[PDB]
Amino acid sequence: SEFNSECIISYGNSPKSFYVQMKHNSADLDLIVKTLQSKEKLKKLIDPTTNSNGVCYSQEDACYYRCSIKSVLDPSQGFEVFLLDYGNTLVVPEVWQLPQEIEPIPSLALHCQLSKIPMDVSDEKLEEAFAALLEQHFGELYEITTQPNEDETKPLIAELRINYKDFVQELVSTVTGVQKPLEAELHNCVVVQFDGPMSFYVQMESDVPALEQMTDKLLDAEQDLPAFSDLKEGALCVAQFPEDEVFYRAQIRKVLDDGKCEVHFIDFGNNAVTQQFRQLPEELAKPARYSRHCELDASTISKCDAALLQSFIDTRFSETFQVEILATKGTGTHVVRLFYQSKNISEKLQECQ
């Protein structure tokens, strides 16, 4: 299963059936694609049958893809195939063999279905809204949590979250005209590390449970985690924090001389240097970070005295604030609007903050 993992929707008409690709596999897909641009060579499947997996060419996309025969048709027209790493379905005239490089990698497209779908809705409607929302986003990353399903012939049961909003909520909204509680645009959180309006960190109250769990699983499996050696730059792993003497998910920021490095705790959004390093299980590498990097929208940064701001936040370091997300930069940081007890920070500040 996947838990709060970052992904994208490769294919999908309705919320009752769609395909997702994990960012935590972007590495392998990158391989397939490239190691797939390798005409002269070829083959013909093992007496092509159902479930057989070979390759196929797309006139439309003008390229190859890892295939899978869904239906063997009259020779007049090839086969009905399922694109393994996308979820698409084409009718290719001819297949081939699976180059013994790629042959081991499993299909990278997860077949999902929203956990809750709006009762009493025509699919012409559902699919329209669905299609609308996917377009209403694109480029950005979704966050998914799955769980297998009873019927093995059905898609995985998934919960999608885009920009801290429940996908079905946005769905129901789009499907009914119905506008939406502006309160939905705000999200409770705490500022775990403030060092300027262009850069601070917060934890979403909605992620607190997940964070705790992660904190457990680590502690438990802590004792028996191998040592981390390849101290490259930006390499993930667990790493002990001095003042704490605990192991957290971290990323190497600056490799120092010694077996010492500066790491950034991606779950608590703070840095420190440590001697300890241990491998991070893939299981605990799927979930997105739990600390969120932020910067205020320009209008706010403008209307505010960098001075008071720092102070105010210091005084209430453990208090809950709320953030409205305006955009996510490429790096992964959010441009946000900050609020205190629902009043805009820039307003709260002017009148004895």
Tab-separated table of C-alpha atoms in Angstrom:
chain	number	residue	atom	x	y	z
A	1	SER	CA	0.000	0.000	0.000
A	2	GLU	CA	0.900	3.688	-0.213
A	3	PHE	CA	0.417	6.160	2.659
A	4	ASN	CA	0.504	9.902	2.039
A	5	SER	CA	2.761	9.273	-0.927
A	6	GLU	CA	3.314	11.895	-3.654
A	7	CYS	CA	1.935	11.089	-7.082
A	8	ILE	CA	0.229	12.119	-10.300
A	9	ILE	CA	-2.722	10.879	-12.314
A	10	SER	CA	-1.456	9.238	-15.489
A	11	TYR	CA	-4.813	8.218	-16.795
A	12	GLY	CA	-8.446	8.220	-15.771
A	13	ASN	CA	-11.967	9.129	-16.881
A	14	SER	CA	-14.026	8.742	-13.696
A	15	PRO	CA	-13.195	8.694	-9.947
A	16	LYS	CA	-14.477	5.130	-10.018
A	17	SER	CA	-11.332	4.184	-11.988
A	18	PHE	CA	-7.982	5.909	-12.561
A	19	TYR	CA	-4.219	5.555	-12.683
A	20	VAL	CA	-1.485	6.987	-10.562
A	21	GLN	CA	2.314	7.087	-10.735
A	22	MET	CA	4.415	7.466	-7.617
A	23	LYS	CA	7.175	10.045	-7.394
A	24	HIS	CA	8.888	7.377	-5.332
A	25	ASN	CA	9.320	5.428	-8.561
A	26	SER	CA	10.067	8.347	-10.877
A	27	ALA	CA	13.546	6.815	-10.971
A	28	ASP	CA	12.417	3.530	-12.530
A	29	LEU	CA	9.978	5.100	-14.988
A	30	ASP	CA	12.813	7.368	-16.103
A	31	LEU	CA	14.735	4.154	-16.765
A	32	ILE	CA	11.953	2.429	-18.714
A	33	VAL	CA	11.421	5.443	-20.970
A	34	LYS	CA	15.110	6.039	-21.749
A	35	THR	CA	16.072	2.326	-21.777
A	36	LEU	CA	13.150	2.040	-24.190
A	37	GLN	CA	14.505	4.365	-26.848
A	38	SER	CA	17.007	1.599	-27.584
A	39	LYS	CA	13.684	-0.537	-34.944
A	40	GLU	CA	16.067	-3.251	-36.220
A	41	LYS	CA	15.753	-5.313	-33.022
A	42	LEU	CA	12.361	-6.833	-32.181
A	43	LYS	CA	10.442	-10.087	-31.705
A	44	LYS	CA	6.980	-11.616	-31.432
A	45	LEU	CA	5.494	-12.710	-28.133
A	46	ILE	CA	5.253	-16.162	-26.583
A	47	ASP	CA	2.374	-17.128	-28.878
A	48	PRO	CA	0.665	-13.883	-27.718
A	49	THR	CA	-1.956	-14.656	-25.090
A	50	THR	CA	-3.882	-12.870	-22.362
A	51	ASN	CA	-1.693	-11.245	-19.717
A	52	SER	CA	1.354	-11.648	-21.951
A	53	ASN	CA	3.582	-8.585	-21.567
A	54	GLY	CA	5.599	-7.197	-24.449
A	55	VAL	CA	6.074	-3.823	-26.098
A	56	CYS	CA	4.014	-1.817	-28.554
A	57	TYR	CA	4.223	1.363	-30.608
A	58	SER	CA	1.833	4.293	-30.432
A	59	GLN	CA	1.158	6.146	-33.657
A	60	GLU	CA	-0.377	8.950	-31.580
A	61	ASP	CA	2.517	9.279	-29.103
A	62	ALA	CA	5.033	8.177	-31.720
A	63	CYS	CA	6.917	6.005	-29.238
A	64	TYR	CA	7.060	2.639	-27.468
A	65	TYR	CA	5.484	1.459	-24.187
A	66	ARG	CA	5.476	-1.566	-21.912
A	67	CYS	CA	2.441	-3.506	-23.109
A	68	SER	CA	0.119	-6.228	-21.781
A	69	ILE	CA	-2.412	-8.067	-23.912
A	70	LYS	CA	-5.932	-7.547	-22.677
A	71	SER	CA	-7.558	-9.159	-25.711
A	72	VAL	CA	-6.185	-11.182	-28.626
A	73	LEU	CA	-8.204	-10.023	-31.630
A	74	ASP	CA	-8.796	-11.154	-35.183
A	75	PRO	CA	-5.478	-10.620	-37.013
A	76	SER	CA	-7.191	-7.982	-39.161
A	77	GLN	CA	-6.420	-5.817	-36.133
A	78	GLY	CA	-3.721	-6.608	-33.568
A	79	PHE	CA	-4.588	-6.733	-29.891
A	80	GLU	CA	-6.253	-4.735	-27.155
A	81	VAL	CA	-3.408	-3.740	-24.882
A	82	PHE	CA	-3.004	-2.073	-21.505
A	83	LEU	CA	-0.129	0.382	-21.106
A	84	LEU	CA	1.503	-0.880	-17.919
A	85	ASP	CA	3.102	2.339	-16.706
A	86	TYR	CA	0.245	4.598	-17.729
A	87	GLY	CA	-3.076	2.770	-17.637
A	88	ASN	CA	-4.008	3.600	-21.204
A	89	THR	CA	-5.720	1.169	-23.563
A	90	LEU	CA	-4.877	1.031	-27.273
A	91	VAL	CA	-5.343	-1.441	-30.116
A	92	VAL	CA	-1.885	-2.177	-31.466
A	93	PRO	CA	-1.416	-4.201	-34.672
A	94	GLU	CA	1.733	-5.918	-33.448
A	95	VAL	CA	3.574	-6.601	-30.179
A	96	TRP	CA	7.177	-7.578	-29.453
A	97	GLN	CA	9.330	-8.907	-26.612
A	98	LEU	CA	10.250	-7.301	-23.313
A	99	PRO	CA	13.967	-6.268	-23.496
A	100	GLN	CA	15.690	-8.256	-20.678
A	101	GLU	CA	16.650	-5.038	-18.843
A	102	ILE	CA	13.137	-3.720	-18.323
A	103	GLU	CA	11.452	-7.166	-18.040
A	104	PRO	CA	11.932	-7.291	-14.220
A	105	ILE	CA	10.325	-3.914	-13.295
A	106	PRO	CA	6.641	-4.178	-12.329
A	107	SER	CA	3.924	-2.024	-13.901
A	108	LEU	CA	4.344	1.476	-12.520
A	109	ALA	CA	0.700	2.530	-12.844
A	110	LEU	CA	-1.494	1.900	-9.804
A	111	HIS	CA	-5.141	1.337	-10.639
A	112	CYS	CA	-7.210	3.328	-8.155
A	113	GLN	CA	-10.681	4.398	-7.206
A	114	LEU	CA	-11.801	7.178	-4.883
A	115	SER	CA	-12.801	5.932	-1.458
A	116	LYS	CA	-16.107	7.795	-1.571
A	117	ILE	CA	-18.099	8.622	-4.677
A	118	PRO	CA	-21.206	10.873	-4.807
A	119	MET	CA	-24.303	8.655	-4.686
A	120	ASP	CA	-26.917	9.444	-7.311
A	121	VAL	CA	-24.709	11.043	-9.959
A	122	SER	CA	-24.736	10.269	-13.663
A	123	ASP	CA	-21.288	9.215	-14.858
A	124	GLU	CA	-21.544	11.759	-17.673
A	125	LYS	CA	-21.592	14.208	-14.764
A	126	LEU	CA	-18.976	12.552	-12.506
A	127	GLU	CA	-16.532	12.044	-15.353
A	128	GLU	CA	-17.060	15.622	-16.468
A	129	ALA	CA	-16.206	17.034	-13.060
A	130	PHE	CA	-13.404	14.577	-12.569
A	131	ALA	CA	-11.917	15.528	-15.917
A	132	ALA	CA	-12.437	19.156	-14.960
A	133	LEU	CA	-10.496	18.940	-11.672
A	134	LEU	CA	-7.572	16.997	-13.137
A	135	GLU	CA	-7.255	19.786	-15.632
A	136	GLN	CA	-7.848	22.298	-12.829
A	137	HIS	CA	-4.483	21.089	-11.494
A	138	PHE	CA	-2.022	19.120	-13.615
A	139	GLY	CA	1.694	19.811	-13.080
A	140	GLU	CA	1.302	19.689	-9.294
A	141	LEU	CA	1.692	16.613	-7.144
A	142	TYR	CA	-1.168	14.757	-5.518
A	143	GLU	CA	-0.847	12.896	-2.266
A	144	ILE	CA	-2.352	9.441	-2.086
A	145	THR	CA	-3.029	6.804	0.567
A	146	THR	CA	-4.231	3.406	-0.526
A	147	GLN	CA	-5.386	0.074	0.807
A	148	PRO	CA	-5.941	-3.130	-1.168
A	149	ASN	CA	-9.490	-4.179	-1.985
A	150	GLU	CA	-11.567	-7.277	-1.184
A	151	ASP	CA	-12.309	-8.108	-4.847
A	152	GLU	CA	-8.930	-8.615	-6.544
A	153	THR	CA	-10.632	-7.778	-9.856
A	154	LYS	CA	-11.364	-4.237	-8.638
A	155	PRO	CA	-9.086	-1.162	-8.287
A	156	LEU	CA	-7.322	-0.089	-5.098
A	157	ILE	CA	-9.331	2.015	-2.664
A	158	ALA	CA	-7.673	5.417	-2.518
A	159	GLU	CA	-7.869	8.753	-0.681
A	160	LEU	CA	-6.506	11.651	-2.706
A	161	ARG	CA	-5.383	14.941	-1.281
A	162	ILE	CA	-4.459	17.853	-3.473
A	163	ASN	CA	-3.083	21.010	-1.863
A	164	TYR	CA	-4.410	19.898	1.540
A	165	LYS	CA	-7.985	19.505	0.285
A	166	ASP	CA	-9.988	16.318	0.052
A	167	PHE	CA	-10.385	15.442	-3.608
A	168	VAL	CA	-13.960	14.212	-3.134
A	169	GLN	CA	-14.800	17.473	-1.485
A	170	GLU	CA	-13.593	19.400	-4.536
A	171	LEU	CA	-15.459	16.815	-6.590
A	172	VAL	CA	-18.781	17.234	-4.797
A	173	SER	CA	-18.243	20.964	-5.106
A	174	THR	CA	-17.587	20.872	-8.857
A	175	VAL	CA	-20.461	18.449	-9.410
A	176	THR	CA	-23.054	20.642	-7.631
A	177	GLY	CA	-22.199	24.185	-8.606
A	178	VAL	CA	-22.174	24.734	-4.891
A	179	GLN	CA	-19.488	27.120	-3.829
A	180	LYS	CA	-17.507	26.210	-0.724
A	181	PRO	CA	-16.775	27.164	2.903
A	182	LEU	CA	-13.988	29.741	2.649
A	183	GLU	CA	-12.853	28.130	5.924
A	184	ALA	CA	-11.768	25.273	3.654
A	185	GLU	CA	-9.086	27.504	2.153
A	186	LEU	CA	-7.507	27.873	5.618
A	187	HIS	CA	-5.644	25.102	7.451
A	188	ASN	CA	-4.585	24.801	11.083
A	189	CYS	CA	-0.857	24.437	11.710
A	190	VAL	CA	2.052	25.419	13.945
A	191	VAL	CA	5.192	27.255	12.932
A	192	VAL	CA	7.988	24.861	13.828
A	193	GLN	CA	10.729	27.132	12.514
A	194	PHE	CA	10.566	30.786	11.506
A	195	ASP	CA	13.550	32.596	10.009
A	196	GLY	CA	12.005	35.198	7.707
A	197	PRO	CA	8.869	35.855	5.628
A	198	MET	CA	10.612	34.271	2.631
A	199	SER	CA	11.328	31.120	4.620
A	200	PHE	CA	9.708	29.405	7.587
A	201	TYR	CA	8.313	25.970	8.371
A	202	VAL	CA	5.013	24.652	9.625
A	203	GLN	CA	3.386	21.319	10.426
A	204	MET	CA	-0.221	20.794	9.370
A	205	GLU	CA	-2.455	19.744	12.263
A	206	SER	CA	-4.032	17.349	9.743
A	207	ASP	CA	-0.690	15.558	9.386
A	208	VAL	CA	0.038	15.304	13.144
A	209	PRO	CA	-1.256	11.707	13.434
A	210	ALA	CA	0.878	10.575	10.470
A	211	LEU	CA	3.926	12.326	11.881
A	212	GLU	CA	3.498	10.575	15.225
A	213	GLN	CA	3.150	7.213	13.545
A	214	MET	CA	6.352	7.865	11.593
A	215	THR	CA	7.980	8.858	14.844
A	216	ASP	CA	6.950	5.467	16.244
A	217	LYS	CA	7.880	3.165	13.387
A	218	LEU	CA	11.302	4.791	13.460
A	219	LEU	CA	11.875	4.376	17.200
A	220	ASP	CA	10.691	0.749	16.965
A	221	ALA	CA	12.773	-0.207	13.912
A	222	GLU	CA	15.422	2.268	15.070
A	223	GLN	CA	17.611	-0.208	16.909
A	224	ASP	CA	17.997	-2.490	13.877
A	225	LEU	CA	18.637	0.016	11.110
A	226	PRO	CA	21.858	-0.467	9.068
A	227	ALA	CA	24.445	2.321	8.984
A	228	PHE	CA	24.353	4.862	6.168
A	229	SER	CA	27.604	5.150	4.199
A	230	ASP	CA	27.213	6.940	0.842
A	231	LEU	CA	27.004	10.459	2.280
A	232	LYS	CA	26.286	12.151	-1.062
A	233	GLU	CA	24.440	15.479	-1.232
A	234	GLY	CA	20.677	15.330	-0.780
A	235	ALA	CA	20.641	11.631	0.036
A	236	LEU	CA	17.758	10.454	2.227
A	237	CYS	CA	18.163	8.468	5.416
A	238	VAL	CA	17.555	8.430	9.129
A	239	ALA	CA	19.976	10.522	11.151
A	240	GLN	CA	20.427	11.240	14.815
A	241	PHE	CA	19.960	14.737	16.132
A	242	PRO	CA	22.468	15.796	18.834
A	243	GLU	CA	20.328	17.749	21.377
A	244	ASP	CA	17.766	14.945	21.043
A	245	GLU	CA	19.890	11.863	20.419
A	246	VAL	CA	16.979	10.485	18.403
A	247	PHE	CA	16.728	9.306	14.822
A	248	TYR	CA	14.631	11.226	12.305
A	249	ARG	CA	14.099	11.091	8.579
A	250	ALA	CA	16.685	13.450	7.158
A	251	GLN	CA	18.408	14.621	4.025
A	252	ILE	CA	22.083	15.526	3.795
A	253	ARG	CA	22.475	19.231	3.137
A	254	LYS	CA	26.247	19.626	3.326
A	255	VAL	CA	28.792	16.796	3.495
A	256	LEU	CA	31.498	17.888	5.907
A	257	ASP	CA	34.974	16.410	6.569
A	258	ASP	CA	34.866	13.327	8.907
A	259	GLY	CA	31.574	11.344	8.622
A	260	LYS	CA	29.917	14.459	9.782
A	261	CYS	CA	27.311	16.210	7.688
A	262	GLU	CA	24.706	18.865	8.019
A	263	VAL	CA	21.279	17.322	7.667
A	264	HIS	CA	17.837	18.818	7.392
A	265	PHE	CA	15.064	17.093	9.301
A	266	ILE	CA	12.389	16.957	6.640
A	267	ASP	CA	9.710	16.198	9.217
A	268	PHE	CA	10.504	18.944	11.691
A	269	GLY	CA	12.041	21.412	9.286
A	270	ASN	CA	15.282	22.140	11.132
A	271	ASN	CA	18.998	21.600	10.520
A	272	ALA	CA	21.860	20.265	12.606
A	273	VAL	CA	25.105	18.373	12.154
A	274	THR	CA	25.448	14.740	13.161
A	275	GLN	CA	27.889	11.843	13.172
A	276	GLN	CA	25.137	9.202	13.071
A	277	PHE	CA	23.513	7.994	9.861
A	278	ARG	CA	21.375	4.950	9.198
A	279	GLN	CA	19.523	3.609	6.168
A	280	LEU	CA	15.898	4.517	5.590
A	281	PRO	CA	13.527	1.669	4.689
A	282	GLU	CA	11.588	2.202	1.441
A	283	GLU	CA	8.422	1.865	3.502
A	284	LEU	CA	9.343	4.981	5.473
A	285	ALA	CA	10.561	6.805	2.384
A	286	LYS	CA	7.202	6.870	0.564
A	287	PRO	CA	5.367	9.385	2.820
A	288	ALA	CA	5.907	13.017	1.917
A	289	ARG	CA	7.766	15.243	4.375
A	290	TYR	CA	5.685	16.413	7.366
A	291	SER	CA	7.221	19.842	7.768
A	292	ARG	CA	6.219	22.269	5.092
A	293	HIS	CA	8.480	24.960	3.712
A	294	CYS	CA	6.760	28.313	3.240
A	295	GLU	CA	7.047	31.985	2.280
A	296	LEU	CA	4.431	34.717	2.430
A	297	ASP	CA	2.734	36.075	-0.650
A	298	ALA	CA	4.226	39.410	-1.751
A	299	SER	CA	1.225	41.535	-0.715
A	300	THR	CA	1.623	40.418	2.874
A	301	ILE	CA	5.424	40.712	2.962
A	302	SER	CA	4.742	44.203	1.728
A	303	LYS	CA	2.088	45.344	4.217
A	304	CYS	CA	4.133	43.921	7.106
A	305	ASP	CA	7.056	45.045	9.240
A	306	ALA	CA	9.582	42.234	9.003
A	307	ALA	CA	10.337	43.314	12.573
A	308	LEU	CA	7.057	42.729	14.422
A	309	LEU	CA	6.465	39.581	12.389
A	310	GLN	CA	9.459	37.771	13.809
A	311	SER	CA	8.552	38.814	17.334
A	312	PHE	CA	4.877	37.893	17.096
A	313	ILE	CA	5.726	34.411	15.805
A	314	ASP	CA	8.372	33.975	18.528
A	315	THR	CA	5.942	34.782	21.314
A	316	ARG	CA	3.462	32.174	20.000
A	317	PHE	CA	5.846	29.483	18.778
A	318	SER	CA	3.601	26.652	19.999
A	319	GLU	CA	0.285	28.230	19.053
A	320	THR	CA	-1.828	27.274	16.074
A	321	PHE	CA	-2.049	29.498	13.046
A	322	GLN	CA	-3.745	28.814	9.744
A	323	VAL	CA	-2.412	28.993	6.217
A	324	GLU	CA	-4.141	29.535	2.901
A	325	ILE	CA	-2.086	28.020	0.072
A	326	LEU	CA	-1.803	30.206	-3.014
A	327	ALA	CA	0.751	28.155	-4.908
A	328	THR	CA	3.562	25.628	-4.669
A	329	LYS	CA	6.918	26.587	-6.151
A	330	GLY	CA	8.892	24.055	-8.140
A	331	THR	CA	11.322	23.370	-5.297
A	332	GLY	CA	8.397	22.283	-3.090
A	333	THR	CA	7.852	25.372	-0.961
A	334	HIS	CA	4.388	26.884	-0.640
A	335	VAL	CA	3.510	30.500	-1.198
A	336	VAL	CA	0.957	31.059	1.495
A	337	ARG	CA	-1.128	33.607	3.272
A	338	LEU	CA	-0.804	33.346	7.083
A	339	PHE	CA	-3.549	33.860	9.656
A	340	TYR	CA	-3.891	34.052	13.404
A	341	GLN	CA	-7.279	33.145	14.853
A	342	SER	CA	-8.677	33.638	11.377
A	343	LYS	CA	-7.598	37.257	11.112
A	344	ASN	CA	-4.857	37.970	8.576
A	345	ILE	CA	-1.428	38.261	10.194
A	346	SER	CA	-0.916	41.673	8.588
A	347	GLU	CA	-4.077	42.849	10.288
A	348	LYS	CA	-3.376	41.172	13.604
A	349	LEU	CA	0.026	42.936	13.628
A	350	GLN	CA	-1.379	46.435	13.283
A	351	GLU	CA	-3.243	47.019	16.565
A	352	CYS	CA	-0.978	45.675	19.307
A	353	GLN	CA	-0.002	42.248	18.010
